[PDB]
C-alpha cells in the first residue's frame, strides 16, 4: 500500500501537495529546513535532511514509502541525486516533477552561462545595478565582482554580515508576481538580472518583468543530475502515480 513522499521546496511541490490531499492520498511532504519557518502544506510535513543516501534509504524503509515524487528545485541537485540512488537501492519508484527549462521568447534578452561562477564572470566591468535573484546560498560567489550594486531577495533576514560591499536585501518569499517584480526592478533601477533556469511557476515573474523593462538576463543553465523518470506537469505526475500502482485512501 501506497504511501507517498514528496520532496518539496517548489511551487510545483505545493501544487502537488494540494492535489494529493484533495484526492485523499497517504503522503508526507519533506522540506530540507533551509529556511526559518517554511510555509504550511496540507500533508504531514517532515523538516530536515535525511543523512545522505544511506539516511534516505533508511527513511524510505522505516516509513514504508511506496513512491517518491522529487519536486525539489532543479538546482537542488544533491537532493535529487540522492533520491535516484536511494530509490534504486530500495526499489521505490521515483519521478521528478520538474518543468521544462524556461525558453526565450520575443522581447527576452538572455545570455546563458553554465554555472554561478560564470554568471559572475558575465557581469560587466563598470559598476552596474544587478538583481541577484538567486537566493542566499551562493551570494558569496559575487564577492568576486564586488564593484556592483546588488539587490538581494532573501526569505529570512540575514544574521551575518553580507559578503558584498554594496547591497540591499528585500526580505520576501514567493510565489512572485509580474506586477510585484516589475515594481521592484523599477524602484531599484536594476540594469541586469541574474537568474537560475528553474522553469517553475513561482519565480518566472522576474523574467517577464525584465522583459517589460527591456533588461538583460544572465541565465544559469541547470546542473547535471543522474537519469530518472521526469514528470513535467502535474497531470504527468498523476498519470505516473496511477501507472505505478499508487492509489488513494478511497475516502
Ligand atoms: C522562487 C523561489 C525561489 N526560491 C529560492 C529563494 C531558493 N529557495 C530556497 C528555499 C526555500 N524557498 C521557499 C520559499 C520555497 C519557494 N521558493 C521559491 C518558490 C516561490 C518557487 C520555487 O522555487 O519553485 C517557492 C515555493 C513557494 C510555494 O509555492 O510554496 C521555501 C519554503 C518556505 O520557506 O516557505 C524554502 C525552504 C525549502 C526547504 O527547506 O526545503 C533557497 C534554497 C534558500 C532561500 C533563502 O533562504 O533565502 C533558495 C536558493 C538558494 O539560496 O540557493 C530561489 C532563489 C531559487 C531559484 O533560483 O529559482 C527562488 C527565488 C528567485 C527570485 O528571487 O526570483
Ligand atoms: N535553487 C534552489 O535549491 C531552490 C528554490 C526553492 C527551493 N529550493 C529548495 O530548497 C531546499 C534546499 O535546496 P538545496 O539547494 O539546499 O538542495 P541540495 O544542495 O540539493 O541539497 C542539500 C542537502 O539538503 C537536504 N535536502 C535538500 N532538499 C531536501 C528536502 N526537500 N527534504 C529533505 N532534505 C532535503 C539533503 O540533505 P541530506 O543528504 O542530509 O539528506 C540534501 O543532500 C530544497 O527543498 C529545494 O527544493 C531550492
Residue numbers in the entry: 1 to 51, 52A, 53 to 251
Task: Recite the paper's sentences.
In this paper we investigate the structure of the precorrin-6A reductase CobK involved in the aerobic pathway, there is a homologous enzyme CbiJ involved in the anaerobic pathway both enzymes catalyse the NADPH-dependent reduction of precorrin-6A5 to the dihydro derivative precorrin-6B6. We have determined the structure of apoenzyme, holoenzyme and a ternary complex with NADPH and product giving unprecedented insights into the structure and mechanism of CobK. CobK comprises two domains, a coenzyme binding domain and a substrate-binding domain, both of β/α architecture. CobK unusually comprises two parallel β-sheet domains arranged so the β-strands point towards the centre of the molecule where the NADPH and substrate bind.
